Amino acid sequence: TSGSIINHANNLNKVINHVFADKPLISETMLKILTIDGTTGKDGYRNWLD
Amino acid sequence: EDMAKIYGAVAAVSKNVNSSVTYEVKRGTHELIKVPTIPHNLVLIQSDNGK
């Protein structure tokens, strides 16, 4: 359903935004692996969480 | 600290639910003007001598 897609997208944006405020939940060691491709770092965690 | 971060993320998602909506329904409602004088459209014509 489009309801599930819309709900999942908005909810996941809140989670990603929250975990990166103040001290990021993920460490810099993990961010480097995801950032190598070229993504900013927020998108890498977002893609992995999917 | 990690558990504090995780619970905040989950709490934010749980608050994203929506309560209700509110709106005003006004379509088809038109104002009314007020007419003071009744149009009669009558004219009286008389002869000069009154015949």
mmCIF file of C-alpha atoms in Angstrom:
data_model
loop_
_atom_site.group_PDB
_atom_site.id
_atom_site.type_symbol
_atom_site.label_atom_id
_atom_site.label_comp_id
_atom_site.label_asym_id
_atom_site.label_seq_id
_atom_site.Cartn_x
_atom_site.Cartn_y
_atom_site.Cartn_z
ATOM 1 C CA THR A 1 0.000 0.000 0.000
ATOM 2 C CA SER A 2 1.059 3.585 -0.637
ATOM 3 C CA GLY A 3 0.181 4.182 3.008
ATOM 4 C CA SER A 4 2.973 1.858 4.114
ATOM 5 C CA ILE A 5 5.483 3.463 1.737
ATOM 6 C CA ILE A 6 4.626 6.996 2.870
ATOM 7 C CA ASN A 7 4.607 6.028 6.548
ATOM 8 C CA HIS A 8 7.924 4.176 6.293
ATOM 9 C CA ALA A 9 9.663 7.043 4.493
ATOM 10 C CA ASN A 10 8.630 9.756 6.952
ATOM 11 C CA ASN A 11 9.281 7.615 10.033
ATOM 12 C CA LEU A 12 12.752 6.626 8.841
ATOM 13 C CA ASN A 13 13.627 10.271 8.186
ATOM 14 C CA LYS A 14 12.864 11.040 11.834
ATOM 15 C CA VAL A 15 15.035 8.145 13.029
ATOM 16 C CA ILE A 16 18.020 9.152 10.889
ATOM 17 C CA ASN A 17 17.657 12.803 11.887
ATOM 18 C CA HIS A 18 17.493 11.891 15.576
ATOM 19 C CA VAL A 19 20.451 9.493 15.677
ATOM 20 C CA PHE A 20 22.751 12.096 14.088
ATOM 21 C CA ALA A 21 21.890 14.954 16.459
ATOM 22 C CA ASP A 22 24.478 15.716 19.164
ATOM 23 C CA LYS A 23 26.691 12.604 19.439
ATOM 24 C CA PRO A 24 26.028 10.287 16.469
ATOM 25 C CA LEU A 25 24.996 6.796 17.518
ATOM 26 C CA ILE A 26 27.297 5.168 14.958
ATOM 27 C CA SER A 27 31.040 5.623 15.339
ATOM 28 C CA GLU A 28 33.399 7.233 12.850
ATOM 29 C CA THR A 29 34.880 3.825 12.017
ATOM 30 C CA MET A 30 31.587 2.579 10.583
ATOM 31 C CA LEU A 31 30.817 5.846 8.788
ATOM 32 C CA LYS A 32 34.071 5.614 6.826
ATOM 33 C CA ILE A 33 33.067 2.272 5.290
ATOM 34 C CA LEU A 34 29.741 3.677 4.096
ATOM 35 C CA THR A 35 31.224 7.011 2.955
ATOM 36 C CA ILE A 36 33.828 5.466 0.622
ATOM 37 C CA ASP A 37 31.332 5.066 -2.230
ATOM 38 C CA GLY A 38 30.585 8.792 -2.220
ATOM 39 C CA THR A 39 27.499 9.264 -0.069
ATOM 40 C CA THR A 40 27.417 11.982 2.580
ATOM 41 C CA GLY A 41 27.210 9.585 5.523
ATOM 42 C CA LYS A 42 23.619 10.156 6.547
ATOM 43 C CA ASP A 43 22.529 8.402 3.348
ATOM 44 C CA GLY A 44 24.878 5.470 3.926
ATOM 45 C CA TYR A 45 23.308 4.669 7.285
ATOM 46 C CA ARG A 46 19.857 5.280 5.809
ATOM 47 C CA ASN A 47 20.566 2.829 2.984
ATOM 48 C CA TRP A 48 21.974 0.229 5.379
ATOM 49 C CA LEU A 49 19.012 0.554 7.748
ATOM 50 C CA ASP A 50 16.631 -0.247 4.880
ATOM 51 C CA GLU B 1 24.022 6.375 26.065
ATOM 52 C CA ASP B 2 23.227 4.141 23.092
ATOM 53 C CA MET B 3 20.014 2.976 24.762
ATOM 54 C CA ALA B 4 19.100 6.609 25.423
ATOM 55 C CA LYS B 5 19.615 7.386 21.731
ATOM 56 C CA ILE B 6 17.621 4.354 20.574
ATOM 57 C CA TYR B 7 14.653 5.055 22.847
ATOM 58 C CA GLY B 8 14.501 8.664 21.685
ATOM 59 C CA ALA B 9 14.375 7.495 18.074
ATOM 60 C CA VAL B 10 11.553 5.060 18.830
ATOM 61 C CA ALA B 11 9.649 7.614 20.915
ATOM 62 C CA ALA B 12 9.752 10.120 18.052
ATOM 63 C CA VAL B 13 8.286 7.561 15.642
ATOM 64 C CA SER B 14 5.505 6.687 18.079
ATOM 65 C CA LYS B 15 4.544 10.370 18.335
ATOM 66 C CA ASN B 16 4.258 10.699 14.538
ATOM 67 C CA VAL B 17 0.702 9.325 14.654
ATOM 68 C CA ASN B 18 -2.011 11.836 13.794
ATOM 69 C CA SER B 19 -5.036 12.712 15.909
ATOM 70 C CA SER B 20 -7.645 14.362 13.677
ATOM 71 C CA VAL B 21 -8.372 17.219 11.273
ATOM 72 C CA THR B 22 -10.502 20.353 11.456
ATOM 73 C CA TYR B 23 -12.036 22.489 8.722
ATOM 74 C CA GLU B 24 -14.904 24.865 7.995
ATOM 75 C CA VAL B 25 -17.638 23.908 5.529
ATOM 76 C CA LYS B 26 -19.032 26.942 3.719
ATOM 77 C CA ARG B 27 -19.657 25.997 0.075
ATOM 78 C CA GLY B 28 -23.087 27.032 -1.143
ATOM 79 C CA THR B 29 -23.540 29.669 1.577
ATOM 80 C CA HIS B 30 -24.168 33.056 -0.052
ATOM 81 C CA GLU B 31 -24.983 36.330 1.660
ATOM 82 C CA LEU B 32 -28.374 38.024 1.363
ATOM 83 C CA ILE B 33 -28.922 41.630 0.331
ATOM 84 C CA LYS B 34 -31.898 43.586 1.641
ATOM 85 C CA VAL B 35 -34.339 45.502 -0.569
ATOM 86 C CA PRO B 36 -35.949 48.573 1.065
ATOM 87 C CA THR B 37 -38.436 49.667 -1.602
ATOM 88 C CA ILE B 38 -41.024 47.619 -3.490
ATOM 89 C CA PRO B 39 -41.005 48.477 -7.226
ATOM 90 C CA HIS B 40 -44.545 49.328 -8.321
ATOM 91 C CA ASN B 41 -43.934 50.720 -11.841
ATOM 92 C CA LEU B 42 -47.256 52.577 -11.923
ATOM 93 C CA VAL B 43 -47.932 56.004 -13.439
ATOM 94 C CA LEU B 44 -51.218 57.917 -13.263
ATOM 95 C CA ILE B 45 -52.150 60.065 -16.272
ATOM 96 C CA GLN B 46 -54.963 62.616 -16.044
ATOM 97 C CA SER B 47 -56.546 65.043 -18.470
ATOM 98 C CA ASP B 48 -55.915 68.740 -17.911
ATOM 99 C CA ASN B 49 -59.599 69.421 -17.240
ATOM 100 C CA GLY B 50 -59.890 66.142 -15.323
ATOM 101 C CA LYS B 51 -62.354 64.532 -17.734
#
